[PDB]
Amino acid sequence: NQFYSVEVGDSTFTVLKRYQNLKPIGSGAQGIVCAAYDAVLDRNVAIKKLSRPFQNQTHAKRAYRELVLMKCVNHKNIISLLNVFTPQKTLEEFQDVYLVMELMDANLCQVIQMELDHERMSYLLYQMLCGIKHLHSAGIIHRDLKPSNIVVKSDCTLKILDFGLASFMMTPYVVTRYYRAPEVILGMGYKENVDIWSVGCIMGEMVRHKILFPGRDYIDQWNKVIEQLGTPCPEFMKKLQPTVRNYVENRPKYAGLTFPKLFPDSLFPADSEHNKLKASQARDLLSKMLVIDPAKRISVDDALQHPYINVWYDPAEVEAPPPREHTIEEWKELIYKEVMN
């Protein structure tokens, strides 16, 4: 057999023989993830197991789209695959997809919990921006960009793991909404700068060491947002569909708080004249990115030329060349066909 079977806690990993010394590093939604040594490449890898992803339209649509996009895109700030396999041999036997990529050191949650100098905080953000630039350059507007799905190496390098939104599921695990734009929360139209909102919830969180806009669902969460940023302006709501519009125009009012109040001097490496200039620079971007009305919110390319981010700029990283419903039966075939080719 090309394959061997280990009990990664509860479930069973049945992987190629090359992958030795498995250790559980990520349990979550579509997949269990393990770290491994790859004796063919002689490096460590992350290996994620899709357990029966055709089981429903949700798991399936994500699995397949992510499979599809994950082979067409070519950027170092966006996940690359090193290998994919099923240990089952026919479509009728088919069950599990295994997804293999470069092993990283930490996710962004863990990194957010740390004090970062400006050089790191900004280099991270420059990279989130390059990857989104890439996704956008191909027609993918992510819209659900969050730090539990972004990974980092000790040398401060970064990859985004997933490809965003296209949704019921019998589950323990809740979806994370906090980084979602007002357009997604209020079912609006949207454009490529919808992802900038997400980046600013991230940036803000790195500084604040607290989730900016938490909450139980879209009710608590729209609240947490207006009572910090203010009620939005008339012609923003002018773009809200009558029923959503009714609800918003009728919520309590707030003038909102200024950006030095939201992100006080306390929170910034601001000891030298360097970190003083960089601190005021960060807040200036923060306030261009935490902007409810997408019409007034900074673009991806403009943010890429903000002086806080501009120092890392590089054409090869920025202007890099770019690339329905089904039954469970039909998704299985779709997914099995991409896995095989």
Ligand SMILES: O[C@H]1CC[C@H](Nc2ncc3nc(Nc4c(F)cc(F)cc4F)n([C@H]4CCOC4)c3n2)CC1
């Ligand atoms: O405490 C530390 C946290 C970071 C961890 N390093 C790490 N490195 C690479 C990873 N790739 C994926 N997922 C994934 C994959 F494997 C293949 C894919 F096709 C797509 C993926 F999304 N994950 C998971 C684990 C948790 O965060 C996401 C990875 N985790 C080391 C331990």
